[PDB]
Amino acid sequence: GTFKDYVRDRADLNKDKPVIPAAALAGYTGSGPIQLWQFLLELLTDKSCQSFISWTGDGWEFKLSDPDEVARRWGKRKNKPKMNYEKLSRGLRYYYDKNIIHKTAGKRYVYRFVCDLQSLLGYTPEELHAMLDVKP
Amino acid sequence: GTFKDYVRDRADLNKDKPVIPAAALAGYTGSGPIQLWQFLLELLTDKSCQSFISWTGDGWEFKLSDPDEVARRWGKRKNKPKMNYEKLSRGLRYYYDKNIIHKTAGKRYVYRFVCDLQSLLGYTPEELHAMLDVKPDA
DNA sequence: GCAGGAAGTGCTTCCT
DNA sequence: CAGGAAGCACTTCCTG
């Protein structure tokens, strides 16, 4: 073990940041403004967020342990004080048809990315789970 | 001078900071995502941009001495590599009815905020001209 | 170039 | 928590 490695290891974050920052992806995609899912994706790639939202451990399956908090952030990111899970949800509903994210029937505040993320990001759920230290 | 002094002294600096940053305005008003007018307003209060965009010295009237650049920066802002004044001018054309901006008749690339920024921003056009050493056109 | 109609984009609002 | 249906602020096109 040398300083070379030390830097290498610290390279993979440890630092204080989200594996896939929304803005960045929006730039690599050129999708213009930031979209809901992109926002979430960053949430789910930042260990600091795992408290109110995280993955279930099953593929692109994730859960919103504390919606109100998520909706708080989403709204605050697009300067929308009157934001809430009620509205935020509606945004998600529009993702069903578009095949971007779907709902886990039977479970509340449980959804799953259905789009081809592995090929877009170049990361597999497990890689992410590992990096994020997902429990289940 | 104590510490707060030493702080304010060195903190007094911006040099590159625009008087009205679009995001902050969006924030204070909760207008949601940044909007083109709030954007242009940012650049007009950013001395650095006087090159391609600046005030005419009259009220809130201004000009785009170099559309193209403005277009590109704005395109960059919202991730729109295809942006150009041609499309951006469209945006601006929907403010005429919303009574936000209004194009000064008989001139090219010359519009004029017509909403009530004074009340909103707390500054008067003249105060801002001063802060930006603006030189009237003829 | 600049005034607008027209259609699409993506959430954000409203409401049944 | 769901939809259906409007809004809103542009982004893209096209016409004159």
From Swiss-Prot, chain A:
DNA-binding region, residue intervals: 34-114
Residues modified to N6-acetyllysine: K4
Region (Helix H5): 125-131
Post-translational modification: Ubiquitinated; which induces proteasomal degradation.
Region Helix HI-1, residue ranges: 3-11
Protein location: Nucleus; Cytoplasm
Residue ranges of the region described as Helix H4: 117-121
Domain of life: Eukaryota
Residue ranges, annotated region (Helix HI-2): 22-29
Tissue and organ distribution: Highly expressed within lymphoid cells. Isoforms c-ETS-1A and Ets-1 p27 are both detected in all fetal tissues tested, but vary with tissue type in adult tissues. None is detected in brain or kidney.
Induction or repression: Up-regulated by retinoic acid, VEGF, TNF-alpha/TNFA, lipopolysaccharide and in response to hypoxia (at protein level).
Function comment: Transcription factor. Directly controls the expression of cytokine and chemokine genes in a wide variety of different cellular contexts. May control the differentiation, survival and proliferation of lymphoid cells. May also regulate angiogenesis through regulation of expression of genes controlling endothelial cell migration and invasion.
Family assignment from sequence similarity: Belongs to the ETS family.
Subunit structure: Binds DNA as a homodimer; homodimerization is required for transcription activation. Interacts with MAF and MAFB. Interacts with PAX5; the interaction alters DNA-binding properties. Interacts with DAXX. Interacts with UBE2I. Interacts with SP100; the interaction is direct and modulates ETS1 transcriptional activity.
Stated name of the protein: Protein C-ets-1
Gene: ETS1
Positions spanned in the full protein: 302 to 437 of 441
